[PDB]
């Protein structure tokens with residue numbers, strides 16, 4: 087029987103397993119599926135750990151999430167089309183669940199799917215090579231439970247290893263002598279650490295917004311965020327100042343591009359991540375910027391230089407969970423033969439070029455959201471993934487953007503229409519800034 | 532011609548290059564040598580970086596050294612037999628030089644040797660395999676300068692990748708909810724961070740002693756160190772208490788095995804390291820405890836299951852630099868044919884078993900130092916490495932041990948006789964406790 091290797095059991099890899107199990111139930115023959123996961127459990131970025139740097143096994147820590155993290159977008163825009171929030175929880179919950187609650191939801195679906203038996207945990211992939219003579223990938227993996235490395239052959243490899251875990255960590259003059267903490271978002275864990283401190287947050291994207299907000303919520307004396315392109319531009323609280331580019335540090339004094347200076351106690355580098363695959367040779371290794379049209383991926387999933395290799399979730403993300411589903415169903419269908427890939431590499435490269443050109447046609451945020459919605463629509467049309475109201479999910483993101491513009495610190499105190507019923511989610515029992523307790527127990531009451 | 536791969540350009544790898552260059556100068560034909568180094572420069576652990584976790588390229592940070600680090604033992608006991616301190620700096624320096632000074636000394640020797648041209652920097656090794664049919668090792672390496680992975684064939688591989696860089700990081704109840712910093716020694720950089728703080732130092736070996744001392748020197752409010760075996764036992768300062776095993780944390784309250792408690796602000800795990808090779812398959816991968824008799828290494832260097840593979844510096848270390856030299860000369864001679872390895876695997880295994888039994892015969896510290904001295908003596912007798920006064924080196928370590936027992940905080944305010952001239956080194960211009968400045972400049976005046 088044909089064999090498929092899935093690298094990673096985060097939301098993407100899990101979606102891939104769910105896709106195959108769903109086809110098997112229909113009566114389709116499916117390949118053998120082996121999912122390799124470095125961590126001790128599934129969940130990907132959502133599987134929280136206090137650990138930073140290297141894990142208990144000596145492997146790079148994957149987790150980039152922190153304490154107090156809540157859903158940063160409306161949940162209504164990431165609902166699985168085949169497994170609703172209502173089905174999982176029974177009842178209606180608010181629109182921005184804490185990490186532990188979304189983790190439960192992710193896990194609930196694959197528990198029902200009975201796909202855990204396909205996963206090997208504590209088993210980082212070390213290497214993948216392809217031999218055209220045999221038409222097989224050789225996957226080398228290390229099993230930390232037995233301290234033994236082995237290799238096995240597969241007809242396909244689906245890489246779902248993430249791209250928000252290997253940090254971009256710039257050096258600025260003074261970083262090495264600064265008497266204070268300098269920590270990348272990747273290693274950030276507990277906002278309580280900076281209570282009563284002046285925090286400098288470098289960056290102007292998703293992580294800067296949220297980590298700055300966590301530090302603010304948990305009692306930072308002040309937040310100073312700095313940008314090198316467009317400011318975030320929100321109406322910040324009184325103790326939050328947005329400055330232009332950092333130039334250098336002299337002692338604990340930060341110098342900015344407009345000539346202004348500020349003393350800071352700690353620096354959090356919210357400077358993003360790189361696509362990094364420590365386990366791939368040149369001929370298989372995806373090289374791309376983080377954006378909505380990923381380089382060298384036909385239909386955003388099939389590797390143009392070897393289309394028997396696929397990648398999931400390698401785009402930057404407005405949509406998340408149901409985009410990964412759409413991708414996983416598509417990749418599944420390509421492997422099963424329900425979809426046939428072009429034999430013309432020129433055609434695959436042109437597909438990517440079209441996507442890049444279309445992404446770049448406008449820099450408008452609503453255009454970007456709609457662009458990715460269009461991508462999900464495109465993939466869903468080409469498989470049996472249950473169609474869902476993508477326009478409705480789109481409107482949720484539009485409303486979410488409006489809410490953040492109005493009150494950046496209170497945007498999580500809002501509800502959105504379910505794409506299934508059209509009904510507004512309930513108000514949560516506690517305002518975000520006062521909801522210091524993380525637990526799922528406290529959230530669900 | 533024959534080819535040798537050296538993995539790592541720390542003191543061990545550097546000693547290996549120097550060994551081969553020395554033989555070439557004698558008129559011996561030598562193999563091609565390729566040294567792969569993950570970092571941007573040589574020096575191994577001594578090559579300091581402010582970075583922790585993953586480096587700028589996304590690879591695990593090798594550095595385990597910190598600011599304010601000074602030589603841990605007498606320099607007279609680690610002097611190269613073929614390159615004295617005098618020949619280098621010219622003058623006579625004190626006996627405990629700061630990191631930056633020793634780095635310069637290390638650098639000095641290999642600069643003179645003209646071996647840098649054999650080294651590829653920013654080039655972590657990804658994998659090594661051996662094929663018996665071809666009798667070749669295939670080394671796969673990633674060049675971060677070009678973002679390109681390649682592979683090449685070698686007749687020998689010499690692994691000098693260190694074993695004090697992948698940390699042992701235990702979990703204790705309360706670690707994940709502790710409102711304070713928890714950092715393994717590997718990630719410890721600036722003692723100033725803990726000024727005015729109550730610090731818990733877990734451990735009772737080299738790292739606990741020195742990191743605890745740095746925290747003390749740089750103004751920690753108090754140090755509580757904890758042991759699970761033998762206490763360190765020194766006469767500690769007034770604000771330093773040694774406790775038995777940590778049981779758990781409840782909030783910031785540490786509970787110990789004797790029923791006592793102590794509130795702490797930060798925890799530094801000085802809990803040691805594992806031997807960890809992310810780039811080796813089972814049939815080549817050394818598995819061993821950290822000790823003086825390393826498992827599965829004939830003569831402490833030749834891998835018993837494939838003796839064309841060698842390992843340097845995998846022992847725990849009383850002796851350092853001149854032991855690595857002795858090892859490197861020995862491995863060189865095996866490769867050149869000046870030494871012939873046994874064709875009897877049982878004999879190689881018996882060699883290791885003898886070393887283990889002899890190490891275990893006594894737990895006395897002086898016995899342990901003499902044991903490794905005997906190892907260096909053994910290796911040096913079997914090559915043309917110049918013979919030096921090993922007994923004198925022993926006496927230096929013995930004096931060092933006694934100074935530490937007398938005053939653990941001031942042992943660095945001592946001098947020792949040169950192993951070449953028998954002249955007591957001059958006293959430094961500032962007592963250790965007062966010598967806050969790191970610079971080599973401040974040290975040398």
Ligand SMILES: Cc1cc2nc3c(=O)[nH]c(=O)nc-3n(C[C@H](O)[C@H](O)[C@H](O)COP(=O)(O)OP(=O)(O)OC[C@H]3O[C@@H](n4cnc5c(N)ncnc54)[C@H](O)[C@@H]3O)c2cc1C
Nearest residue numbers: 094096097098124130131157158210211247248250399406
């Ligand atoms: C800080 C942060 C907050 C976020 N918040 C939200 C949010 O609120 N809502 C939302 O919808 N999205 C959020 N995201 C987006 C996130 O990317 C997706 O939710 C989702 O986690 C991506 O799923 P994935 O499976 O593609 O990747 P990941 O979740 O990164 O999972 C990849 C998996 O691959 C494994 N892996 C990696 N290397 C190897 C190897 N060599 N061998 C084996 N396994 C390996 C990892 O251990 C991991 O389990 C957030 C992202 C970040 C960084």
Ligand SMILES: Cc1cc2nc3c(=O)[nH]c(=O)nc-3n(C[C@H](O)[C@H](O)[C@H](O)COP(=O)(O)OP(=O)(O)OC[C@H]3O[C@@H](n4cnc5c(N)ncnc54)[C@H](O)[C@@H]3O)c2cc1C
Nearest residue numbers: 539541542543569575576602603655656692693695844851
């Ligand atoms: C905290 C600390 C303090 C110490 N203080 C002293 C002291 O005062 N005096 C003393 O004599 N000794 C000291 N030591 C001992 C130290 O082990 C030796 O001085 C020496 O650094 C060991 O040299 P090495 O080359 O064997 O290993 P390392 O110094 O660890 O160097 C190994 C090299 O291999 C490289 N490498 C690792 N993996 C890869 C890969 N996959 N591909 C390519 N390259 C790789 C690393 O980047 C590194 O350059 C200390 C050790 C520690 C941990």
Ligand SMILES: NC(=O)c1ccc[n+]([C@@H]2O[C@H](COP(=O)([O-])OP(=O)(O)OC[C@H]3O[C@@H](n4cnc5c(N)ncnc54)[C@H](OP(=O)(O)O)[C@@H]3O)[C@@H](O)[C@H]2O)c1
Nearest residue numbers: 158256289290291292293294296314315356357358402403
């Ligand atoms: N954290 C979340 O809430 C969350 C949730 C889900 C998904 N994600 C995804 O994660 C992706 C990454 O989010 P992110 O905020 O972590 O990273 P990011 O989007 O790449 O943003 C990095 C920020 O740091 C700045 N920066 C980068 N390098 C810098 C340097 N050397 N000096 C100064 N500033 C620098 C960037 O500015 P320039 O624009 O000038 O480069 C940008 O403002 C997002 O696109 C988002 O999809 C995030």
Ligand SMILES: NC(=O)c1ccc[n+]([C@@H]2O[C@H](COP(=O)([O-])OP(=O)(O)OC[C@H]3O[C@@H](n4cnc5c(N)ncnc54)[C@H](OP(=O)(O)O)[C@@H]3O)[C@@H](O)[C@H]2O)c1
Nearest residue numbers: 603701734735736737738739741759760801802803847848
């Ligand atoms: N020059 C220096 O200052 C320096 C500094 C660091 C390292 N080194 C070199 O590298 C070696 C390592 O030194 P090291 O101190 O870093 O490591 P180490 O010698 O392995 O010591 C580890 C210490 O932590 C304790 N420990 C380990 N696991 C623990 C756990 N789960 N819970 C509680 N305690 C735990 C150990 O106790 P047990 O004994 O009970 O296991 C031991 O006391 C040394 O032999 C030396 O060669 C040198």
